Amino acid sequence: DEFLFISNNFKQYKEFIDMDTAKHYFECRNIEGLNHILDSYKDSKSTKEKNLFALVKVLLATLTEEDCLTERTYLSNYLINIETWSHYETVLFNNCMFIFESCFIEMVFSKVILNLDKYNTLYYGNESIRMFVNMLILFIQRQEYDKASEILAKIEDYQLNDDCLYERCCVSFFDGIIGLINGKEGAEQKCVQILEIFQLLNCKTIHHMFQTYLEAIKHKLS
Amino acid sequence: DEFLFISNNFKQYKEFIDMDTAKHYFECRNIEGLNHILDSYKDSKSTKEKNLFALVKVLLATLTEEDCLTERTYLSNYLINIETWSHYETVLFNNCMFIFESCFIEMVFSKVILNLDKYNTLYYGNESIRMFVNMLILFIQRQEYDKASEILAKIEDYQLNDDCLYERCCVSFFDGIIGLINGKEGAEQKCVQILEIFQLLNCKTIHHMFQTYLEAIKHKLS
Numbered sequence: 001d002e003f004l005f006i007s008n009n010f011k012q013y014k015e016f017i018d019m020d021t022a023k024h025y026f027e028c029r030n031i032e033g034l035n036h037i038l039d040s041y042k043d044s045k046s047t048k049e050k051n052l053f054a055l056v057k058v059l060l061a062t063l064t065e066e067d068c069l070t071e072r073t074y075l076s077n078y079l080i081n082i083e084t085w086s087h088y089e090t091v092l093f094n095n096c097m098f099i100f101e102s103c104f105i106e107m108v109f110s111k112v113i114l115n116l117d118k119y120n121t122l123y124y125g126n127e128s129i130r131m132f133v134n135m136l137i138l139f140i141q142r143q144e145y146d147k148a149s150e151i152l153a154k155i156e157d158y159q160l161n162d163d164c165l166y167e168r169c170c171v172s173f174f175d176g177i178i179g180l181i182n183g184k185e186g187a188e189q190k191c192v193q194i195l196e197i198f199q200l201l202n203c204k205t206i207h208h209m210f211q212t213y214l215e216a217i218k219h220k221l222s
Numbered sequence: 223d224e225f226l227f228i229s230n231n232f233k234q235y236k237e238f239i240d241m242d243t244a245k246h247y248f249e250c251r252n253i254e255g256l257n258h259i260l261d262s263y264k265d266s267k268s269t270k271e272k273n274l275f276a277l278v279k280v281l282l283a284t285l286t287e288e289d290c291l292t293e294r295t296y297l298s299n300y301l302i303n304i305e306t307w308s309h310y311e312t313v314l315f316n317n318c319m320f321i322f323e324s325c326f327i328e329m330v331f332s333k334v335i336l337n338l339d340k341y342n343t344l345y346y347g348n349e350s351i352r353m354f355v356n357m358l359i360l361f362i363q364r365q366e367y368d369k370a371s372e373i374l375a376k377i378e379d380y381q382l383n384d385d386c387l388y389e390r391c392c393v394s395f396f397d398g399i400i401g402l403i404n405g406k407e408g409a410e411q412k413c414v415q416i417l418e419i420f421q422l423l424n425c426k427t428i429h430h431m432f433q434t435y436l437e438a439i440k441h442k443l444s
Contacts, residue, residue: 001307001308001309001312001337001340001341002308002309002310003309003340003344004232005235005238005309006344006346007229008235010226013227013230016227085223086223086224087223087224087225087227088224090223115223118223118225119223122225122228124228
């Protein structure tokens with residue numbers, strides 16, 4: 001029957017939806033973001049309600065140049081002081097890691113690296129890497145090379161856990177990027193080689209993405 | 223983490239809610255019933271979408287003198303042709319068993335009566351009985367007494383199964399009703415005794431329900 005119907009009681013899944021909704025609400029519509037904030041300050045009592053309000057506020061602030069230090073520091077606080085990693089906090093982190101300072105991001109990453117393995121027995125098995133790469137990108141666009149390299153070394157030591165090759169591809173490619181901006185020896189060779197392996201397997205989407213990135217970095221290399 | 227988050231894929235749970243929406247839309251709101259039918263004939267392709275469309279059709283038709291024999295026959299069809307019973311169909315049946323012919327209902331009772339035990343290991347543990355009474359009243363309100371007593375005899379045979387005390391109370395009360403309309407021996411005594419036991423424990427809601435029903439039957443005894 002549906003006794004699993006009772007397993008609806010974990011209906012905080014709605015939060016996930018709302019967040020996700022808001023995550024794309026950020027794209028265009030503003031006034032209903034305002035409505036969102038209205039409703040979520042009507043219900044500003046619980047910690048996750050506060051988290052949601054904080055995120056919507058953050059997005060609204062990037063939309064309208066507003067300062068939002070309260071909500072920013074709140075989110076940073078919450079994500080730093082979480083003990084055990086659940087998908088909720090990984091979603092939240094992946095969403096709002098853009099306004100985070102690289103120290104906080106570094107610490108959060110330092111935390112996920114152990115509680116990650118449940119994604120590795122299990123799209124979502126890539127959520128991990130989807131996080132890692134995101135971080136890396138944000139470091140390279142923030143031009144924090146030592147911290148990026150720190151992530152890379154950490155991940156390469158933790159490459160022992162997952163033998164998935166999209167991982168090793170990304171770490172070698174971004175390593176190549178580091179060498180590229182640092183002006184190292186065979187960096188661009190690594191990058192363009194990985195691009196070559198990407199298009200060779202006729203995986204046109206990913207190859208397009210990473211080629212676009214490499215050419216964007218080359219452009220910014222002015 | 224949330225690997226139970228992946229178990230969102232059983233998101234046909236929406237149907238339940240949708241159904242539930244209509245369940246209270248039927249009480250008052252018409253216009254969004256019309257909107258519902260609009261959308262559900264817009265999407266009249268899948269079987270449960272068809273089920274929902276049929277239910278909304280049914281409710282709007284009881285509200286607004288429409289015939290809805292087609293959708294009636296559809297619902298009857300679906301509820302006859304399920305092999306193994308799930309909570310979904312208990313919900314659907316409990317919703318639309320009002321416009322049904324007692325024949326289909328009879329077969330449904332013959333089918334659900336075995337698949338009941340998931341409710342019996344397990345509000346919802348009483349849902350089974352919540353269905354039965356729904357049937358029973360509808361039989362007496364349709365004035366089909368022999369069928370009602372027949373069902374009751376079956377339930378008393380299946381009383382061996384569940385030792386829940388709301389059951390024996392209900393069957394004793396309705397048995398009393400049967401004796402009351404057939405004019406059998408000391409029936410109303412049994413009824414008023416059961417009501418008495420209800421009100422003695424100061425559970426006024428249930429006692430109120432069954433007393434108002436009993437007085438309605440007393441009235442119709444003209």
